[PDB]
Design a binder for these strands. Sequence first.
RNA 1: AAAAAUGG
RNA 2: AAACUUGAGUGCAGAAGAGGAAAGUGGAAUUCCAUGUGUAGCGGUGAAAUGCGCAGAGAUAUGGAGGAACACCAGUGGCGAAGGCGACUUUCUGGUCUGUAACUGACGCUGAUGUGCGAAAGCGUGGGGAUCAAACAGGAUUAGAUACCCUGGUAGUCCACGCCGUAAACGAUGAGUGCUAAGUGUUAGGGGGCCCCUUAGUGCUGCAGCUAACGCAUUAAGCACUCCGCCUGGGGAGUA
Lengths: 86, 93, 131, 63
Amino acid sequence: ISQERKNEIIKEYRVHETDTGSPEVQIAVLTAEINAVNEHLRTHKKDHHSRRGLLKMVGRRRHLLNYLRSKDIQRYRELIKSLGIR
Amino acid sequence: RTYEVMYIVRPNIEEDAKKALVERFNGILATEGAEVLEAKDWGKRRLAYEINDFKDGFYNIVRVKSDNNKATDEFQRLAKISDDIIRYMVIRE
Amino acid sequence: TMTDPIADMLTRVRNANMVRHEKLELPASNIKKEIAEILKSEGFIKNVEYVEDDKQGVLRLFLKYGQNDERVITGLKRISKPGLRVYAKASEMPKVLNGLGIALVSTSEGVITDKEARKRNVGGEIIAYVW
Amino acid sequence: KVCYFTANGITHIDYKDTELLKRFISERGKILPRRVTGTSAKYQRMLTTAIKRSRHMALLPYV
RNA sequence: AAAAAUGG
RNA sequence: AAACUUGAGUGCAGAAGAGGAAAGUGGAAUUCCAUGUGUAGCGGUGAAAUGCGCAGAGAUAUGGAGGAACACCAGUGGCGAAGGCGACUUUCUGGUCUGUAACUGACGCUGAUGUGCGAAAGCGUGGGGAUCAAACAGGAUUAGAUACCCUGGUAGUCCACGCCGUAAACGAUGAGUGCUAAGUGUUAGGGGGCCCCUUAGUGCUGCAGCUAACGCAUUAAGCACUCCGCCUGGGGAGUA
Ligand SMILES: [Mg+2]
């Protein structure tokens, strides 16, 4: 995604101002990247090399989601219903 | 996003026909929301090798800026169809 | 990743002893500090210093070499490990090198040597052997 | 030895700079090797790309 | 850089 | 249960790359075709012959058709998990490295079962077809020659979509982490005065230590800890 769109996402999902590394921010950015690569692959099906990075991103987002659900259930539920990633 | 389009017109083009052709192709490069930053002509130059059996060619340089490449794609399609432009190339930067 | 800081510290000591280095800086922890202090008290290392820096802190060991440059520490062996933990009773406390070595133990009465464990009549997790 | 681009400070090679490219092209048109021309690898890559572009645009010859 | 097998 | 920032990620500033997918454009050469000139061979081998040519071949000059691969650059160079990736242009897209220390605050490592990719050959449907070339056919060699050599030549080699899932798929060396003398080249960075320091790779030489030896040696085959896979004499047999 463009750095402008990434800035928009981090602004939207940041817990507080100057927050870029929160699990919410990271998993929202990962969701955006995952969707972008999915749209790429729909046209370029045989891009196995790209799909591998997509799968790595999916796994990182899942581990972030697991950590968030372990630390704060309410935040996890709110975030997943906000991003539509369940 | 910037683009430099270089093309070669056949050496046996009359002045008026060449002017019409360059005007048409500059307009093509300008159509699809693309602003022609600057177009210029390097004159007729010797080709390093014969292209379509021509030893010379009129070299046209154009620089155009756009957020997409529809103008460049139309230019390339019409240059392929044209038998007056011998060579063309588009460089991003 | 790192999985046994005690083993890492013992291996640092072993490698430095092999190369005949004089000092040794390692990341610090309470168990490591107690092990180092036991080593100093028993005479296997010359000195121990603690640097209360940022992050974790640092332990600076100074090793001891006898006359003719002979190495005082012959060997260190991790006994209890993350993959398999070993505990012993007071009556089953092992003697390292027929008593010429020490077994560092972790007990309810603090981490001590096997001699102290036998004297106080306690057991615990046998951290390591040093001879 | 020294690299021409590193010494002159030029950080870009233009494929329409035929006068410059002729310096590193061979008599028959082959691209002179880096170990002979003294150029760096970083700028050797740019030089090769520029030379191939120029060949495509007929500024420079293939043979 | 023609071809020249085998031997309880 | 509560704190921390070193691990692990995120932000910001940069860097290089044959990393991948899809279109487009070039030049050299091979083959074939059409003409002009011109004639007794060309081709090939150790030597020959088959073959092509005298119905005009081969050679030579001009043009046309088509397929495939990208000379030079090119380098123990680069990129990728591996297989692999080398003309150029554009579009989409993955990963890696360097420097700050705003940010999250252990979110990590490994990984049975699963799920995907995976050279070449091969298979199915459709297309394409220059070159090369299993099978095959001649010609040679030979005691024989179901070969090596020569002249041809089909599948295939190419493309799209499916399948197959194997290689000495090799560094015959699982992954992660930390510690342990040095000398020297190279790739991408960074800091300090041609020089010094430093991060990440990629090579060579070389201590301690290890090894049956050969050798390895900060890119360990050394010293350690975690997880996984695997071995237990040869054959039978990777067979039933
Ligand atoms: Mg015999």
